Ligand binder design. Structure first.
Ligand SMILES: *[C@@H]1O[C@H](CO)[C@@H](O)[C@H](O)[C@H]1NC(C)=O
Ligand SMILES: *[C@@H]1O[C@H](CO)[C@@H](O)[C@H](O)[C@H]1NC(C)=O
Lengths: 49, 49, 50, 49
């Protein structure tokens, strides 16, 4: 957890999007949902925690 | 010692990225028969492997 | 629906957000596509989805 | 002409888009068809006109 928090959080990096929330429109799309509208789909990490 | 073992796989839908969902655009895209198929196959196979 | 919102043309779906942004009237993503807009007469903010 | 397939079903449309009679196992991207009765929505600021 130190090596996963002490280093810069990848909020602007490759984080998969909650596709179930991106099409609801209940809030303006974040960086993850905005990329989904352009066909870019970041798949879930194979290294499951 | 630190060794990288994985990289977040990314897949892109060729039709949505270039045509932005425009119906007339996707008909023109079909002329580039090998363009979308080559890009999508390269990304999908790397993610599966 | 086809929309022309504040000199921006596109096709999408418009809904009502519980976002309360205070600045501006149009919100765009990095690609330039319109993500939402604000009605000046009432202050409600709407979202846009393909 | 030796054999043909009609691009009518879900699996056949994927084959026609992939330009192959055999589809390797995996995950394939796709997009639903767009409606045609699209209304017009206009928003514009009131100014000296
Ligand atoms: C907006 O609505 C969403 C979904 O109900 C909720 O998760 C979020 O906390 C709400 N935020 C505000 C500002 O009410
Ligand atoms: C105006 O804003 C109020 C805020 O409570 C909301 O109830 C109402 O439906 C909005 N109406 C329009 C036409 O924007």
């Amino acid at each position: 957890d130190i090596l996963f928090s002490k280093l810069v959080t990848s909020g602007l990096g490759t984080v998969d999007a909650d596709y179930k929330k991106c099409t609801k429109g209940l809030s303006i799309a974040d960086l993850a949902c905005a990329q989904y509208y352009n066909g870019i789909m970041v798949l879930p990490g194979v290294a499951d925690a | 010692e630190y060794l990288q073992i994985t990289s977040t796989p990314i897949v892109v839908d060729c039709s949505t990225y270039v045509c932005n969902g425009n119906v007339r655009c996707v008909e023109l895209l079909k002329q580039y028969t090998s363009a979308c198929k080559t890009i999508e196959d390269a990304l999908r196979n790397s993610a599966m492997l | 629906t086809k929309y022309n919102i504040y000199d921006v043309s596109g096709v999408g779906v418009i809904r009502i957000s519980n976002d309360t942004f205070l600045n501006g009237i149009t919100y765009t993503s990095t690609s330039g596509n319109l993500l939402g807009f604000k009605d000046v007469t009432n202050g409600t903010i709407y979202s846009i989805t393909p | 002409i030796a054999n043909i397939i009609y691009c009518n079903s879900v699996i056949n449309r994927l084959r026609c888009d992939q330009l192959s009679f055999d589809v390797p196992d995996g995950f394939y991207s796709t997009s639903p068809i767009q409606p045609v009765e699209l209304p017009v929505s206009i928003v514009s600021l009131p100014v000296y006109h």
